A paper describes a structure:
Gasdermins (GSDMs) are pore-forming proteins that play critical roles in host defence through pyroptosis. Recently, [name] was shown to exhibit direct bactericidal activity through its pore-forming activity.
We thus subjected [name] isoform 1 to cryo-EM analysis. The [name] pore was found to be 24–26-fold symmetric. 3D refinement of the 24-fold symmetric pore led to a final map at 4.96 Å overall resolution whereas focus refinement improved local resolution of the globular domain to 4.48 Å, allowing us to build an atomic model of the [name] pore using the structure of [name] in the complex of [name]/[name].8 as a starting model. The interaction in the adjacent globular domains contains mostly residues from helix α3 of one subunit interacting with the region around α2 and β11 of its neighbouring subunit; and the α1 helix from one subunit juxtaposing end-on with the α1 helix from the next subunit through hydrogen-bonding and hydrophobic interactions. Previous studies have identified the N-terminal α1 helix (‘thumb’, binding site 1 (BS1)), the β1–β2 loop with a hydrophobic tip flanked by positively charged residues (‘wrist’, binding site 2 (BS2)) in the GSDM globular domain and a positively charged lipid-binding site (binding site 3 (BS3)) present on the membrane-inserted β7–β8 hairpin as structural elements for lipid binding. As expected, all three binding sites are conserved in [name]. BS1 and BS2 contain basic residues of R10 and K14 in the α1 helix and K43, R44 and R50 in the β1–β2 loop interacting with the acidic lipid head groups, and hydrophobic residues of F46 and F47 in the β1–β2 loop hydrophobic tip inserting into the lipid bilayer as a membrane anchor, whereas BS3 is mediated by basic residues of R174 and R195 in β7 and β8. Surprisingly, the density of the region 2 in [name] pore is also visible, regardless of the relatively lower resolution. However, only one basic residue (R229) is structurally conserved in the [name] isoform 1 pore. Due to a four-amino-acid (222AGLD225) insertion in the interdomain linker, the residue at the first position (P1) is replaced by a negatively charged D225. Substitution by an acidic residue at this position probably weakens membrane attachment by repelling the acidic membrane surface, thus attenuating the pore-forming activity of [name] isoform 1.
Numbering used by the authors:
A (entry chain J), B (entry chain K), C (entry chain L), D (entry chain I): 2 to 69, 81 to 91, 112 to 174, 194 to 233
C-alpha cells in the first residue's frame, strides 16, 4: 500500500543493489532531515522498520564549517504496479569535511541531552547530500498516486559517532548495531 | 460513513505510513485547534476514538514569542469509494522555538485550572504547522460528498508537557500514555 | 418522516462524528434559541428526544457585555432518501467571554423563577454562534420536501450553570446528567 | 533484477573474456572511485560479492605527480532481456607512472589509519583510467530500465600494495587473496 518506502528502496536498490544506503519513512521533517540529524530507534516489526526523530545537531561556528553533481532522473515503473518519476540533485560535500566536523568542538546546552540519554540511539550522520527538487506525482496500485514537493530527500547514510559527557569521538565502520556504554 | 476521519487518516498515512501523526475529529474548532491547544481524553470505543476540547494556551508576551513550505496537493481517490481533493499549506516553525516556549514563564488565571484538574488529560502540543486553505468539496460513497472551508487543519502532533502548580516542565519522548501525578 | 432531525443530525455528524454537539427539534423559537436560552427536559421516548422551552436569559447591561467565520456550504444527499442544501454563517464569540458572562452579576425578577423551580432542568448554554441564512427548500422521501427561512439555527452546545438563590456558578465539564440540589 | 552488475560484467567480458578486470557495485561514489582508492572486503555470499568503501589516497605533491584513447561504444542487447547503450572514454596513463607513485613518499595523518587497521583489506589500485561520459538510460527485463549520468566509471583493476608503519612496498602480481601481516 505505502509508496514512499517503495520509492526510497527503489532509490536504494538502483543506487546500490541491497547495500549500504538507508531509506527514510517520514516526510514530517524530510527536507530538514539533512546532515547533522537523527533517526528513530530500530525495531523489526513488519520487517525492518525504525522510528523517526531527526532533530538538529549544529553546535558551533567559529572556524570554517559552513562553506559551500548534475541532475539525475529515474522515470520508470515496477510490475501491484508502481510508477516512479523521480529527479535528483546532488551537492558534493568532501569526505575530509567529516574529519573536520569531528575536529569541531562539541559544546551545546540545547534541550537534547535529556532525550538523547533517555533514548541511547547512538545517532549517525549522512555522508554526501542526496537532494530531490523533482515533480509532484507518482503512481501506485493495490488507485492511490502519491505527490511529492520539490527540495526533499529520500535516502541517507551512516557515520556512527559516540557522545561522552563533554567531547565526542567517531565510529566510521558503519556501526549501527546499537551497542555502546553512553 | 464518516469522511473526515478518512481524509485525516489519508493525510496521516501518506504523511508517514502509520506513524507519529495524529488526526482530529471535530471541526467545531478545527482552525483554532492550532498550536497551544488541547484535545479530549482518549477512549477505545469503536476503535481509537478520543474526545475533543482544545481551548487556548497562550500565557505571556514579554520576550519575543510571536515572531513570524510551498503549496502541496493530494488529488486522488480510494477504492466503499472515496475521493479527496486536498491542498495543504505549511508555515515553518523552528524546533528550538519549542524550547523557547518551554522557557516562557507560565502564569495565568484563566478559568482553565478547574477543568484541567478535573480532567487530568496531560495536554500535548503540535510540532510544526499543518494548514489547508484548499477547496470545498470531497466525495464519499456508502451519496454524501463533504465540503470543507479554507484555512483549516486536519492532523496534529505530540509534545507532552507536565503542569505543576506554578511552573511547567517537558516530556518530549511522545508520551501520551496518560500517566502522571498532577 | 421528520426532516429537521435528519438535517440537524447531519450537521452534528459532519460537524463532529457523534460528538459533543446537540441538535434542536422545534423552530417555534429556533432563531431566538440563540445564546442565553434554555431547552426542554430530556426523555428517552422514541430514542433521544427532549422537550423544548428556551426563554430569555439576559440579566444586566452595565459593563461591556454586548460588544460585537465565512460562509459554509453543505450541498448533498443521503441514501428513504434525503437531500440537503444548507448554508451556514458563523459569528465568532470568545471563550473568555463565557467567563465574563459568569462574572456578570445575576439579578432579575422576570417571571422565570417559578417555572425554573418547577422544572429543575439545570439549563445550559451554547459555546459559539451557529447561524444559517440559507435558502428555503430541502427534500425528503418516505413526497415531502421541507422549506427553511434564512437567519435560523440548527445545533447548539453545552455549558452547565447552577443557580443558587442569588448568584450563580459554573459546571463547565459538559454536565447534562440532570443532577443538582437547586 | 540488478542491472549495474550486468552492465559492468558485460564490460568486463567483452573487455577480456572472464579475465583480470574487476567490476564495481555501488555508484554512491563511483566517479570518485578513481585511481588512488579502495574497495570493500570480499565475501562469497550470493556469488562473488564484495563490500564497497573507496576513500582517498593522495598523500604528497612535491615532485611531478599530477601531470596530464578516443571514444568507444557498446550498443547491444543480451537475450531475461537486457539492453546496453554504453559509451566509454579513456585517458591514457603510463605504467612507469605506477613505479613513480610507488617511489612517492608515503606520509599522511588522515583519519584512515584506524579504519585501515580495523579492516586489513590490503587495498589495491587501478592500472589505467576507464571513464564513461555516456548517455543516461539502459533497459532490463525480469519493466525497470536504469539511467546513468555522464562522467562515471564501471570497472577497475588490481595492483596490490602493502602498508608498513611508515613507508610502503608493492605486490604487482595481481595479489588479492587477502593474505598479509600488516
Amino acid at each position: 500500500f505505502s509508496v514512499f518506502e517503495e520509492i526510497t528502496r527503489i532509490v536504494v536498490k538502483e543506487m546500490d543493489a541491497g547495500g549500504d544506503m538507508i531509506a527514510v519513512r517520514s516526510l514530517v521533517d524530510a527536507d530538514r532531515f539533512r546532515c547533522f540529524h537523527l533517526v528513530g530507534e530500530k525495531r523489526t516489526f513488519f520487517g525492518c522498520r525504525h522510528y523517526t526523530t531527526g532533530l538538529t545537531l549544529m553546535d558551533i561556528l567559529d572556524t570554517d564549517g559552513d562553506k559551500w553533481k548534475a541532475e539525475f532522473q529515474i522515470l520508470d515503473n515496477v510490475d501491484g504496479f508502481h510508477h516512479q518519476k523521480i529527479k535528483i540533485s546532488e551537492n558534493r560535500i568532501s569526505q575530509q569535511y567529516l574529519a573536520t566536523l569531528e575536529n569541531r568542538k562539541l559544546k551545546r546546552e540545547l534541550p537534547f541531552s535529556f532525550r538523547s540519554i533517555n533514548t541511547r540511539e547512538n545517532l549517525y550522520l549522512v555522508t554526501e547530500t542526496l537532494e530531490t527538487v523533482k515533480e509532484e506525482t507518482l503512481k501506485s496500485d493495490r488507485q492511490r498516486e502519491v505527490t511529492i514537493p520539490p527540495n526533499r530527500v529520500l535516502s541517507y547514510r551512516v557515520k556512527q559517532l559516540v557522545f561522552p559527557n563533554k567531547e565526542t569521538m567517531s565510529a566510521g565502520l558503519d556501526i549501527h548495531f546499537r551497542g555502546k556504554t553512553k
